[PDB]
Structure 1
Amino acid sequence: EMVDNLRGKSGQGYYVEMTVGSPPQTLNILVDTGSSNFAVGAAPHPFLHRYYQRQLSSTYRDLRKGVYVPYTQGKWEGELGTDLVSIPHGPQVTVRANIAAITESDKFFIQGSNWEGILGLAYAEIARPDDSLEPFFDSLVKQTHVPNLFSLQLCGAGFPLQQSEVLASVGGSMIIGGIDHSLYTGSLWYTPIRREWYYEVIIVRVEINGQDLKMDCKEYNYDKSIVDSGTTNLRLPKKVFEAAVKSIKAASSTEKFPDGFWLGEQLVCWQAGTTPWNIFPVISLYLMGEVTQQSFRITILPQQYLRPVEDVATSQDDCYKFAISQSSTGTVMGAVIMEGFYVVFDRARKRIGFAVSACHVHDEFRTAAVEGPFVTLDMEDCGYN
């Protein structure tokens, strides 16, 4: 029913079909756990397949307020309204929610992409222009008996997605209100959401094919550590990045490659038949557990951090980006982490659960894993203030 309701790209994000207004207008909306606004294209920007036409809806109501969201040299800007929203491949209910009608933008929409708005599933406190603008999911829970949780299985699997292989090779599932046991194996292990703004969690130890990085663990969460479906890469604060980089470098001497590859300034390339996965180490993050002194680890492969970028001449040349990178925003657990796992955003219990995804990419030697319990101390002082 809601299984397989997501399409598009690890690399251009995952989008769900929604309806807005009466009669219902269908749009593809990117699912974004790193933000808190529901915002849709409202004018004919050339890159968009479609856009919200308020004229055509009886339930539209103006809030007479504008909103302006700068990000990194780009922006979007819009006018705030409310209307009636549904999700065709979601729970059978209709909510009135805030909608930012996007009317100007730069470096927001992506040419070639097939989605036309964003669903921010994170918390009010990061809602623009301010926390009073009640986020969609809050609204969906206030106005119905749908339970206060959702889960995500991000796949992006078989062979490279495109624009009739973005439509017709559907890349994962959003289960609204629940958890489906068919989407994972073993058990869920749960880390507490440290605060309800982004989905902040505390990472307490990092390992690369076995080897601790013996750093203050305040530096794994420096500024913050977050789970974010709108981000493609595994992103790591400078010190941890440089440190991880060096030991990923060391673990990897088996074969060799250039400086700027590690910094995402050039991309990497070998023959097909001839991917060298073994010379790459597993990455392991330990996260804070539900109990004092107890952690669990999730473990990902290079399958998920060396992630195909769209071929030289769709040939047999294989070209990927190192999907780990730097940040001054904290640790960002994006699709590289998420496509390893079924992720349960248990908002009622203030926690995030992780299990091994039933669709994750692997082989026969290794695998993605979730394992505990482990004994780890001074865990909440891995945080930052």
Structure 2
Amino acid sequence: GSFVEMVDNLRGKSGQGYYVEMTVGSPPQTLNILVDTGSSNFAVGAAPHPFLHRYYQRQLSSTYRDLRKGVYVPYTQGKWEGELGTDLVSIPHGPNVTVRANIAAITESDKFFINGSNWEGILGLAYAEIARPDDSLEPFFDSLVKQTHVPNLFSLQLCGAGFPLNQSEVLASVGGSMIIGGIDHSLYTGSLWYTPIRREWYYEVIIVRVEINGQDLKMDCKEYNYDKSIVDSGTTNLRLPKKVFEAAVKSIKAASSTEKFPDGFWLGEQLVCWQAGTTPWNIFPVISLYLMGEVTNQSFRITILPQQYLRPVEDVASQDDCYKFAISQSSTGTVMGAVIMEGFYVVFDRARKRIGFAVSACHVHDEFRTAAVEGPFVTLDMEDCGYN
């Protein structure tokens, strides 16, 4: 019901990530750690870097254990290399428990750390199947549940400000909540609707229908989940498979056609700006994603506003309100990233192999429209939407 100790324990923003304070080692070393449901390694800066103000010093921890094994983790953009070990870990604004967890001590990296993000490591909250070097490296959350009485569930409320924050404002500001071991009813309005976790590797789900202002995108539903659809707090954008991206953008352009925007805007590259307070939210469509429900032949929908998919950014000069388009293409399936998660309180119910969605008590909206979670809808042949 109520988890006051964990409410408001996140800071950050969609563009650079949301992070939680953790301590590692004995005596405790404090570090800020990116909350990432799209990966499964707990990995921390452990050597000086131009963008790190502090790092894990294994030689100062009496409880550090060396696993004598290296790990190399390349991504499409960026990479890091490190040394595997274990140590005692706590989350100060979390459950009052201390656990021994695997930690990859990052000793070298390229384009991984972000200048001014304020985080020094990543907490991969997904499953062992996608851990590096292999699935025998138990992820943090699995350790936490095995070693303590914490229920096998966590929930995330990511709070977008609706306007830009500089590095000073992000430091002073509450970015949201990670509730470990429960669901806090103050963080949402309306009902929670649950979709099954298709397979425990990423948090994989199945999308069964997409609408732009109520108009069906009318693609074969397999296209929406090609080659998977995941919920990922460590990706900024809503990312869509190439063909779905092309269809969706064509439809969003048609809905907003009273104003013409440059190709670079739709490509996610360039900002657009309006005079202060005059952003024409009403010309942009709402986007609905229908998700497989828990009951046979039942779906539900989550609906976001342009206040979610237009990401506020600071002007290159002004008092203008400026934004980038935060929907982009993917060659690795749909990614429901931070700009989608900012609409919703998201419950990662690992114990019951399901993900819940409710309207966020902190989502950005206007006097005419709000984000929504609605159901049920009768939907047939939903398993056929999943890609094999």
Report the TM-score when normalising by structure 1.
Answer: 0.98
Alpha-carbon displacement from aligned partner over 1:257-294 (angstroms, at most 9, x marks no partner):
11221112322222213101000000000000001110
Separation of aligned partners in 1, 2:149 and 2:234 = 27
Contact 2:162/2:307, CA 8 A, preserved across alignment = no
Q: Deviations over 1:46-65 (max 9, x none)?
A: 11011000011110000000
Displacement, 1:162? 2.2
Alignment partners' CA distance in 2, 1:273 and 1:287: 34
Match among 222, 227, 240 for residue 223 of structure 1: 227
Counterpart CA distance in 2 for 1:148 and 1:73 is: 32
Matched, 1:185 2:196: no
Indicate conservation of the 8 Å contact 1:308/1:320, yes or no: yes
CA-to-aligned-CA distance 1:244-264 (integer Å, 9 cap, x gap): 011111111121111221112
Contact persistence 1:8–1:161 (CA under 8 A): no
- Aligned-partner Cα distance in 1 for 2:294–2:367: 32
More helix by share: 2
- Give 1:93 shift: 0.2
Q: Distance in 2 between matches of 1:51 and 1:156?
A: 27
Shift of 1:87: 0.2
Instruction: Give the total of aligned pairs.
Output: 384
Q: CA deviation at 1:319?
A: 2.0
Displacement of 1:73 after TM fit?
4.1
- For 1:60 and 1:186, locate their aligned partners in 2 and report how far apart those are by CA, in whole Å: 45
**Retained in 2: the 8 A contact 1:307–1:321?**
yes
Q: How does 1:132-147 map to 2 (within 5 A)?
A: 132-147=136-151
Q: Secondary structure at the match of 1:160?
A: coil
Summarize the Cα distance change of 1:158–1:216 in structure 2 as closer, same or farther, 3 Å threshold.
closer
- Contact kept, 8 Å, 1:312 with 1:319, in 2: the verdict is no
Secondary structure of 1:246's counterpart equals helix
CA contact (8 A) 2:13 2:159 kept: no
**Which stretch of structure 1 is more off in the superposition, 281-290 or 2-11?**
2-11
Shift of 1:158: 6.2
Q: How much has 1:324 moved relative to structure 2? A: 0.3
SS in structure 2 at match of 1:319: strand
1:316 matched to 2:319: yes
CA shift for structure 1 position 304: 0.7
Once the two structures are superposed, what CA deviation does each residue of 1:153-173 show, in whole Å capped at 9, x if it has no partner? 000226532222111011100
Moved more, 224-233 or 246-255: 246-255
Aligned partner of 1:334 in structure 2 is 337
Tell me the distance in 1 between the aligned counterparts of 2:202 and 2:105.
Answer: 23
CA distance in 2, matches of 1:358, 1:73: 34
Give the 3-state SS of the residue equivalent to 1:260 in structure 2: helix
In structure 1, stretches of 5+ residues that fail to align are none
- 2 CA distance for matches of 1:312 and 1:41? 31
Instruction: Report the Cα offset of residue 147 of structure 1.
Output: 0.2
C-alpha distance in structure 1 between counterparts of 2:189 and 2:13, whole Å: 24
Counterpart contact for 1:40–1:52, Cα < 8 Å: yes
Structure 1 residue 176: Cα displacement: 0.2
| Equivalent-residue separation in structure 1 for 2:148 and 2:74 (angstroms) | 33
Runs of 4+ with >3 A deviation = none
Could you report, residue by residue, the CA deviation over 1:18-58 in whole angstroms, capped at 9, with x for unpaired residues?
Answer: 00000000000000000000000000101101100001111
3-state DSSP class of the match of 1:164? helix
CA distance, structure 2, for counterparts of residue 41 and residue 195 of structure 1 = 31
Distance (Å, rounded) in 1 between the aligned partners of 2:96 and 2:278: 48
Report the CA distance shift for 1:130/1:343 in structure 2 as closer, same or farther (over 3 A). same
Residues 93-119 of structure 1: CA distance to partner in whole angstroms, max 9, x if unpaired?
A: 000000000000001001112100000
Tell me by how many angstroms 1:13 deviates: 0.5
C-alpha distance in 1 between matches for 2:356 and 2:181: 15
* CA shift for structure 1 position 364: 1.1
Residues 152 and 174 in structure 1, CA contact (< 8 A), matched pair in contact too? yes
Decide whether the 8 Å contact of 2:290 with 2:301 is kept in 1. yes
Deviation at 1:317, TM superposition (A): 2.2
Tell me how far apart the structure 2 counterparts of residues 34 and 190 of structure 1 sit (CA, whole Å). 19
Identity within the alignment, %:
99
TM-score (norm 2): 0.98
